[PDB]
């Protein structure tokens, strides 16, 4: 309900640096920026208990719920299939390596919910999963849920050329690692370009994002950024909406190559469905 | 590379 209003900006009537770019495309990480403190209070770390390592990115939609990629939990081709005892979710972080003493909170998972029809055998269609936290988290200036779009929010922001923003602790290069969360603002590309760019069968639970080889700007998510959110700020009620989930790509910031993201809106119903059956 | 976490968390 308080979704998408960052306590250290919107709340205080402060604007972070690249917000303008976002908002000026509505017509008013590889090669990304260092995030500002409290700029993405809904960003989660998906952390492995042993080895103690970061597996993916994620979002905080509720005080009890996290949104990630299905592929984070379960990928048979790679012998990946995690259970809610092999993980710890870290909320309120900035630096990637250190245990930020009194700023971050670490939770245990209560149940994992993969999309019944996630298609790990062909194209990662429906790459979405929900985790429900053992106990609710308290919001602080650094921990705060993002909003989930509605048919008319998804309607009007989700368009070719609109900038959205990606965030992650992942690879800074294909063949680099940050000390601090990174950010990158990328434009939504039309379907046709998305299609003609790869051999994989593009579905509607998908959208692609990146610049063309020709706009003189690069940027992409990369290794370790999975599950993290692709967000947009409605110029209407200026709240942040989670529009996509980092799904798949071909390389990292490869010319004439774009990012594919789960269409959060398209699967919103399944997400309702699971929150009020067992949440 | 990771600082250890509250051993109380595993
Ligand atoms: N630029 C990228 C943004 C997304 C992340 C995570 N992606 C990942 O690592 C996901 C996860 C599991 C399977 N996998 C693949 O085999 N491929 C390769 C791209 S592909 O065209 O070969 C492909 C298409 C459909 C299914 C599998 C692979 C891919 O992107 N993934 C890395 C940096
Ligand atoms: Na194609
Ligand atoms: Na690219």
Short mmCIF file of N, CA and C in Angstrom, two decimals, chain A residues 47 49 52 88 90 96-99 106, chain B:
data_model
loop_
_atom_site.label_atom_id
_atom_site.label_comp_id
_atom_site.label_asym_id
_atom_site.label_seq_id
_atom_site.Cartn_x
_atom_site.Cartn_y
_atom_site.Cartn_z
N UNK A 47 20.83 -15.44 -1.04
CA UNK A 47 22.08 -15.98 -0.52
C UNK A 47 22.05 -17.42 -0.03
N UNK A 49 23.38 -20.56 1.84
CA UNK A 49 23.91 -20.89 3.18
C UNK A 49 25.29 -21.55 3.07
N UNK A 52 28.66 -20.00 1.29
CA UNK A 52 27.97 -18.73 1.66
C UNK A 52 28.30 -17.84 0.46
N UNK A 88 19.10 -18.18 2.37
CA UNK A 88 18.93 -17.02 3.23
C UNK A 88 18.75 -15.78 2.33
N UNK A 90 18.80 -11.74 2.00
CA UNK A 90 19.41 -10.57 2.67
C UNK A 90 18.80 -9.26 2.18
N UNK A 96 28.09 -5.59 -1.28
CA UNK A 96 27.78 -6.96 -1.72
C UNK A 96 28.39 -8.07 -0.81
N UNK A 97 29.61 -7.80 -0.37
CA UNK A 97 30.49 -8.71 0.42
C UNK A 97 30.26 -8.74 1.94
N UNK A 98 30.12 -7.55 2.49
CA UNK A 98 30.06 -7.37 3.95
C UNK A 98 28.66 -7.51 4.52
N UNK A 99 28.70 -7.82 5.80
CA UNK A 99 27.50 -7.96 6.61
C UNK A 99 27.27 -6.65 7.36
N UNK A 106 18.36 -10.29 7.44
CA UNK A 106 18.52 -11.61 6.84
C UNK A 106 17.35 -12.47 7.26
N UNK B 1 34.87 -14.22 -0.19
CA UNK B 1 35.11 -12.76 -0.45
C UNK B 1 34.11 -12.04 0.46
N UNK B 2 33.18 -12.90 0.83
CA UNK B 2 32.03 -12.59 1.66
C UNK B 2 32.36 -12.60 3.14
N UNK B 3 32.11 -11.47 3.78
CA UNK B 3 32.25 -11.43 5.25
C UNK B 3 31.23 -12.44 5.76
N UNK B 4 31.51 -13.15 6.82
CA UNK B 4 30.63 -14.15 7.45
C UNK B 4 29.41 -13.47 8.09
N UNK B 5 28.32 -14.21 8.21
CA UNK B 5 27.09 -13.65 8.79
C UNK B 5 26.80 -14.24 10.16
N UNK B 6 26.02 -13.48 10.92
CA UNK B 6 25.61 -13.95 12.27
C UNK B 6 25.38 -15.46 12.14
N UNK B 7 26.37 -16.11 12.72
CA UNK B 7 26.43 -17.56 12.81
C UNK B 7 25.07 -18.03 13.29
N UNK B 8 24.28 -17.08 13.77
CA UNK B 8 22.94 -17.37 14.31
C UNK B 8 21.89 -17.58 13.23
N UNK B 9 22.26 -17.33 12.00
CA UNK B 9 21.53 -17.38 10.76
C UNK B 9 21.66 -18.60 9.85
N UNK B 10 22.09 -19.72 10.38
CA UNK B 10 22.29 -20.98 9.67
C UNK B 10 22.15 -22.19 10.60
#
